[PDB]
Amino acid sequence: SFSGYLKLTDNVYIKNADIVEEAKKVKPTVVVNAANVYLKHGGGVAGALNKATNNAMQVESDDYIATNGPLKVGGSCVLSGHNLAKHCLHVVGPNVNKGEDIQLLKSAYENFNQHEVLLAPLLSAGIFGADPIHSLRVCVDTVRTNVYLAVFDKNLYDKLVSSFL
Numbered sequence: 001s002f003s004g005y006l007k008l009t010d011n012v013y014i015k016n017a018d019i020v021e022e023a024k025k026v027k028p029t030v031v032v033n034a035a036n037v038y039l040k041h042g043g044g045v046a047g048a049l050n051k052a053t054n055n056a057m058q059v060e061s062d063d064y065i066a067t068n069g070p071l072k073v074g075g076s077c078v079l080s081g082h083n084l085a086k087h088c089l090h091v092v093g094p095n096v097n098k099g100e101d102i103q104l105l106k107s108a109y110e111n112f113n114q115h116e117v118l119l120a121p122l123l124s125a126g127i128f129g130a131d132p133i134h135s136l137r138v139c140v141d142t143v144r145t146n147v148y149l150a151v152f153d154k155n156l157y158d159k160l161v162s163s164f165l
């Protein structure tokens with residue numbers, strides 16, 4: 001199971017780790033992807049998870065979009081976890097860099113409540129432009145299921161832990 005995590009709350013855990021390396025090690029039931037509405041896994045966590053699947057995540061995602069159309073910002077879909085996990089929960093947090101409503105971050109985290117345990121990144125953090133400290137706060141105040149957060153950046157991980165209220 002999950003190792004080396006710092007416990008933040010009853011159900012939220014955090015580790016300075018590469019979520020791809022973490023997923024290949026734990027092979028969790030659910031890995032969360034920091035998805036966009038089109039499931040175009042170009043960069044950030046999505047590009048990294050997709051590259052670890054040898055593009056199989058993108059091929060599967062393009063078929064999902066062809067059938068269903070785009071996701072909503074704040075929405076999600078469950079697809080295969082490929083070689084990383086049993087499932088991948090593709091969750092769309094608001095992209096502040098595209099002017100999306102930061103209030104949708106709580107809706108985005110609510111998707112985690114449908115899964116007993118998840119390996120996840122901080123939604124809307126990184127290239128999505130939101131403040132990761134705010135993302136962690138919304139995560140702890142929204143998610144009730146067991147969430148193991150992987151924060152790639154060591155300096156950000158230290159800032160998140162040291163400032164966690």
Ligand SMILES: CN(C[C@@H]1CCOC1)c1ncncc1Cl
Pocket residue numbers: 113114115116144145
């Ligand atoms: C028991 N679970 C986990 C569910 C069970 C299957 O999907 C996740 C809960 N999750 C959130 N809030 C309350 C409860 Cl009781």
